[PDB]
């Protein structure tokens, strides 16, 4: 089946496009969702990414998790 | 008073003959207005570097990298 991933600890300036940039080279992406602040318009610093195939999502998690992006270590995990 | 003694004097004669109007007016307030009819050419011209910072930087670094060998 597909696979949602939490992506958090993002610099507040990372865009939905940038996540697509960083994650997409791993596999097909069913949906990317960066949580925005409805009041300010800036991101909440976190979001979810859905890979069409889970074995891909797993590689992305492995490769990207705990690694600095914009100087902020990126967190990536499995979500029910 | 300690802190007010020795207040700077550039010319002792300054304000010596200062007498103000009885409604606190002393200085003349209507200077002749400068209206140039003729003008001296400017010796130099101020201009900005058109090159982007990041360009300039990345060019520099590389230029002093190949200058290593």
């Amino acid at each position: 089946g597909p696979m949602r991933l939490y992506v958090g600890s993002l610099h507040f300036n990372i865009t939905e496009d940038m996540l697509r940039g960083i994650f997409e080279p791993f596999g097909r992406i069913e949906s990317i969702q960066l949580m925005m602040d409805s009041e300010t318009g800036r991101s909440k610093g976190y979001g979810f990414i859905t890979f069409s195939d889970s074995e891909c999502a797993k590689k992305a998690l492995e490769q990207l998790n705990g690694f600095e992006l914009a100087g902020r270590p990126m967190k990536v995990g499995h979500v029910t | 008073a300690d802190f007010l003694k020795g207040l700077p004097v550039y010319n002792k004669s300054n304000f010596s003959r200062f007498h103000a109007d009885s409604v606190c007016k002393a200085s003349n307030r209507r200077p002749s207005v400068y209206l140039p009819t003729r003008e001296y050419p400017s010796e130099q011209i101020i201009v900005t570097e058109k090159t982007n910072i990041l360009l300039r930087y990345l060019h520099q670094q590389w230029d002093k990298k190949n200058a290593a060998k």
Binding site: - | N14, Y34, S42, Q44, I46, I53
Partner: protein
């Protein structure tokens, strides 16, 4: 559609001031920035000598003096708000003053975003570069280098995106900036080195430190201290690396410090100014070392006293400090060593009138219109009454009829001030002495003959010329006496310090004044009887005698002592010259001659030749004029005594006339006493007046201090008084000082039951003649009065003051409750008639065809006023964001929105509701609006531009009918707070008259033109721009371009009246060069003169 904008009053707020040696290396200069104007002064013995004023084509944002290694005097660096950079030099050869543009260019960056705390311009102490903070994230460096044709600026990326203040440090091997920045973590101070070779930053001399959260200012301390001082809300800190010193003095905790300046060149002492107008000294305690050097031991702050609220401070010389105020009058103050009884060390020497900010204003006919403003803020709050004409501040009035002449006199030779006033009567003379009042007798002077002249002469002697004799007086005694051979009467008399010419009928006799001797030099007989005489020595022994005759009605210049005729002028008519005078104005010599019918002739006069040129004529009064020179504020001017008293003076090398606001003056003389410095003595048929004259200019201004902030003003003719909203700060409540609202005759307090430092609002009733606060009505706790109108409503015959308010709470952030209150001022007290609750802030109100139009938040509402004395809503309009401004004409309503431009409504009487006619679809952050006419709407916005909107008179469809088209655009350079229909002139090339009031205290006038006049004057502009050079080499067209961050657009449909008027001030050849090619056909340099003269009469 076609508009014309001219200055009626130049900006008066001080934005910056700097001191240095700019004109010469020796002299000491004060330079003052008033928006677009740069004033240049030289410090002298008497105080400030004006040298030069220059009008920049830009708002001056940065103004720094600096001296590079190979320079004899300081250079001036200016940056304007539109990023015009220049380096300027004062040059002088002989008498000719020029400002040289050493360097110029525009430093704007497209990529850049203007910073929170605005434009900051700093120069390295070793003049190695100029640093600019223009935008968040970028530091612009202009390397200073003589041997280049291109001063190439570069940007250095700055990781700190929110910079509060930056300075260059002293005593550094590399140029080093020190700055305060804000981040989530707080406020901090950091240093960087600026390397020109790397076009990059380097790690600075010392590390970063967390500082005060309210830290707002950086001071670069000079050697031998080096390092920096950081000023916070309640803390002052010194840093120099290993050394860190911090003081938290309680004294500074009350208010915020907003400006500073260095007193001692080595930085041992600094002046600091706070928001409440307190003045402090910051002392740095030196520590001498075995090694030649000096370390900072301690920091002390000391309260010196109170000044105006200072925008900027500068120490001048001999304990004299110039206080430049934005919110109040500017000042010269003295710092003393001894305090006064109140414990104050500060003494005011001079005050300069600042109208700014004009927050509201109205035109009243107190046939000449007077303008009354709401001026200033906080303790500086005031009303200013502005009139055309000149006023006399009377200090004394004495019952003395039949005065036939008037002379000032120094009795003591060592006294350099007048102590005596000699008066003339039909056959008598009386002598008066100033403590104060009361008369005397002067030895050597006669009292039983009429004095025709008297006063101080050469060799420490005195003179008196009567109808009988000339008396020279020394120890006061008669030391010489001249009489006519046959003892005939002297009929006319004139005298300087050295010479005497007297007339005996047609006989003329020339005397000289020597030690204890009146020496007859020569004699002659004129063709006709002598009417009047003058021998003023022009730039103290005259080679010239000016004479007016009977019979031929002639003015003549005669050589002395030969009495040879150099020039005869037939004045014409059957009326004799009454008074004649030779005078200098602006190192230019004139003969002035006044006829007994009230006409005045003035000529240019050549000392060497004696030639009169340029008979110009003016009409002053019906009665004969008597001319007398006087000195006022270091300038020589002529008083013309008549039924219409006038001062004659010079502006831009041309003679100007201004009415003095008195009934009639027969005779006058200047009076420089100890009690009345540079005063004037005036005499009508019955009174001797002593008083001070207001500044010699077009505008005459009166100040009514309130000691709290005025907010709105309106006039109530029927009550013969003004209503003024004001607010005072009270502390947690109890007031800070007595002010207008706490000192009324009567007072009232709101009793409505409808609903850290605090504001307390009031409606002030102020007498229109005396400007006494007759009554003050205090609003509810937390109620802010926003709007005010005086008017009649409905069928009700009473006239009311109506106030719109808003409830403002600490734990809330926008208004949701408000009130409209109807007051009646009757029998000395303010009565509350009616009160209407509303669900927001009542931003604006206008009377509208006997109804009350109001704006509440984003709603515009129309109320009717019922029989039952209540406001009843008729209709609403809700399509606004924030309706702050309302203007009406007929059934039309112009709506100004803070963020959403202008909107035109109409009231439909049959439908009984509003209709949106059209709106301006450009976003514009409005400050003020006016209706110019039915189809033309004037707006001023937040970027200092004016624009004019029109209904589309070509609209075919209804959709097109609904756009307001922006047909006029113009960068004004001011922030408009109020627009007003009216004129300061008595009252054609122009239609309509809208005055405006600005934050900087500028008063302007907008008027309309025909397409024809516009096309002529626009062409004129373009020609004037090719002839007239702009200091800094800024293009006029660039300056006047409509400029916002979204768009930049050339000005259209607007003529710069100031430019146009300056055509009268250029040289004749350059005048002709402007008119080079033109049609009527060909060039009428004199016809264009006649045209512009018309345009100057609109104000």
């Amino acid at each position: 559609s076609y508009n014309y904008v001219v200055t009626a009053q130049k900006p008066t707020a001080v934005n910056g001031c700097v001191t240095g040696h700019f004109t010469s290396a020796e002299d000491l200069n004060l330079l003052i920035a008033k928006n677009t104007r740069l004033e240049i002064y030289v410090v002298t013995a008497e105080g400030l000598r004006p040298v030069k004023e220059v009008g920049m084509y830009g708002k001056i944002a940065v103004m720094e003096l600096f001296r590079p290694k190979g320079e004899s005097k300081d250079l001036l660096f200016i940056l304007t708000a539109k990023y015009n950079a220049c380096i300027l030099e004062y040059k002088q050869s002989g008498e000719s003053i020029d400002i040289i543009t050493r360097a110029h260019g525009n430093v704007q960056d497209r990529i850049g975003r203007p910073s929170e705390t605005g434009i900051i311009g700093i120069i390295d102490p070793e003049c190695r570069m100029i640093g600019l903070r223009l935008y968040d994230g970028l530091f612009k460096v202009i390397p200073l280098d003589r041997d280049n044709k291109e001063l190439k600026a570069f940007n250095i990326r700055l990781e700190e995106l929110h910079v509060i203040d930056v300075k260059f440090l002293y005593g550094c091997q590399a140029p080093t900036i020190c700055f305060v920045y804000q981040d989530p973590q707080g406020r901090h101070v950091k240093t960087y080195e600026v390397s020109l070779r790397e076009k990059e930053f380097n790690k600075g001399p010392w590390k970063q430190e967390n500082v005060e959260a309210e830290a707002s200012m950086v001071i670069a301390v000079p050697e031998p201290f080096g390092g920096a001082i950081i000023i916070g809300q309640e803390s002052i800190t010194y840093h120099n690396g290993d050394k860190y010193l911090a003081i938290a003095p309680p004294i500074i905790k009350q208010s915020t410090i907003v400006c500073h300046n260095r007193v001692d060149p080595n930085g041992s002492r600094y002046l600091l100014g706070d928001m409440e107008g307190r003045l402090f000294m910051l002392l740095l305690e030196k520590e001498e070392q075995m090694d030649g050097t000096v370390t900072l031991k301690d920091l002390r702050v000391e309260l010196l006293g109170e000044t105006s609220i200072a925008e900027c401070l500068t120490y001048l010389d001999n304990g004299v400090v110039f206080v430049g105020s934005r919110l109040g009058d500017s000042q010269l103050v003295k710092l003393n060593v001894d305090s006064n009884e109140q414990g104050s060390y500060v003494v005011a020497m001079e005050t300069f009138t600042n109208l700014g900010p004009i927050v509201d204003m109205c035109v009243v006919d107190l046939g000449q219109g007077q303008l009354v403003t709401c001026s200033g803020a906080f303790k500086e709050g005031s009303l200013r009454i502005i009139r055309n004409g000149i006023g006399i501040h009377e200090h004394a009035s004495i019952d003395l009829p039949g005065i036939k002449g008037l002379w000032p006199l120094r009795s003591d030779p060592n006294r350099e001030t007048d102590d005596t006033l000699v008066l003339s009567f039909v056959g008598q003379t009386r002598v008066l002495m100033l403590n104060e009042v009361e008369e005397t007798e002067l030895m050597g002077f006669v009292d039983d003959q009429q004095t025709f002249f008297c006063g101080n002469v050469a060799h420490q002697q005195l003179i008196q010329i009567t109808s009988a004799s000339v008396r020279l007086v020394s120890p006061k005694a008669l030391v010489s006496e001249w009489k006519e051979p046959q003892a005939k009467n002297i009929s006319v008399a004139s005298c300087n310090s050295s010479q005497v010419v007297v007339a005996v009928g047609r006989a003329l006799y020339y005397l000289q004044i020597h030690p204890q001797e009146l020496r007859q030099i020569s004699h002659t007989e004129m063709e006709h009887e002598v009417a009047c005489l003058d021998i003023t020595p022009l730039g103290g022994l005259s080679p010239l005698c000016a004479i007016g005759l009977w019979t031929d009605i002639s003015a003549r210049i005669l050589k002395l002592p030969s009495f040879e005729l150099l020039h005869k002028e037939m004045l014409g008519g059957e009326i004799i010259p009454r008074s004649i005078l030779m005078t200098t104005f602006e190192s230019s010599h004139y003969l002035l001659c006044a006829l007994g019918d009230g006409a005045l002739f003035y000529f240019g006069l050549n000392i060497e030749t004696g030639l009169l040129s340029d008979r110009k004529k003016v009409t002053l009064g019906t009665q004969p004029t008597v001319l007398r020179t006087f000195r006022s504020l270091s300038t020589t001017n002529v008083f013309a005594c008549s039924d219409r008293p006038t001062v004659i003076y010079s502006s831009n090398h041309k003679l100007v006339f201004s009415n003095v606001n008195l009934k009639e003056v027969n005779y006058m003389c200047p009076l420089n006493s100890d009690g009345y410095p540079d005063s004037l003595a005036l005499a009508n048929n019955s009174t001797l007046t002593i008083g001070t004259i207001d500044e010699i200019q077009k505008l005459h201004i009166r100040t009514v201090p309130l000691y709290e902030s005025p907010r709105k003003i309106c006039y109530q003719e029927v009550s013969q008084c003004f209503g003024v909203l004001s607010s005072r700060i009270e502390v947690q409540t109890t007031a800070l000082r007595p002010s207008a609202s706490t000192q009324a005759l009567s007072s009232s307090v709101s009793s409505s039951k409808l609903f850290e430092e605090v504001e307390v609002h009031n409606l002030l009733i102020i007498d229109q003649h005396t400007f006494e606060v007759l009554h003050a009505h205090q609003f509810l706790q937390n109620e802010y009065a926003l709007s005010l109108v005086s008017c009649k409503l409905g069928k009700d015959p009473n006239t009311y003051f109506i106030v719109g308010t808003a409830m403002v709470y600490p734990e809330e952030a926008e208004p949701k409750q408000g009130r409209i209150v109807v007051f009646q001022y009757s029998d000395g007290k303010l009565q509350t008639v009616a009160e209407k609750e509303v669900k927001g802030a009542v931003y604006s109100m206008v009377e509208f065809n006997g109804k009350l139009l109001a704006s509440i938040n984003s709603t515009v509402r129309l109320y009717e006023w019922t029989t039952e004395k209540e406001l009843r809503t008729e209709c609403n309009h809700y399509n606004n964001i924030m309706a702050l401004y309302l203007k009406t004409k007929g059934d039309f309503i112009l709506v100004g929105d803070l963020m959403r431009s202008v909107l035109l409504l109409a009231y439909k009487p049959m439908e009984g509701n509003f209709e949106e006619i059209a709106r301006d679809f450009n976003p514009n952050w409005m400050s003020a609006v006016e209706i110019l006419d039915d189809d033309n709407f004037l707006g001023a916005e937040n970027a200092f531009n004016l624009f004019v909107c029109q209904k589309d008179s070509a609209a075919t469809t209804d959709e097109e009918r609904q756009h307001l088209q922006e047909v006029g655009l113009f960068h004004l350079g001011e922030f408009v707070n109020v627009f007003c229909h009216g004129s300061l002139v008595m009252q054609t090339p122009t239609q309509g008259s809208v005055l405006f009031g600005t934050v900087n205290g500028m008063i302007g006038l907008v008027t309309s033109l025909s397409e024809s006049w516009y096309n002529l004057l626009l062409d004129m502009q373009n020609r004037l721009n090719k002839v007239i050079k702009s200091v800094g080499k800024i293009e006029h067209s660039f300056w006047r371009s409509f400029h916002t961050e979204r768009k930049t657009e050339p000005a259209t449909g607007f003529i710069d009246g100031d430019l146009i008027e300056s055509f009268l001030d250029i040289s004749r050849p350059k005048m002709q060069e402007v008119v080079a090619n033109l049609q009527y056909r060909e060039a009428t340099a004199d016809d264009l003169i006649k045209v512009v003269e018309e345009l100057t009469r609109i104000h």
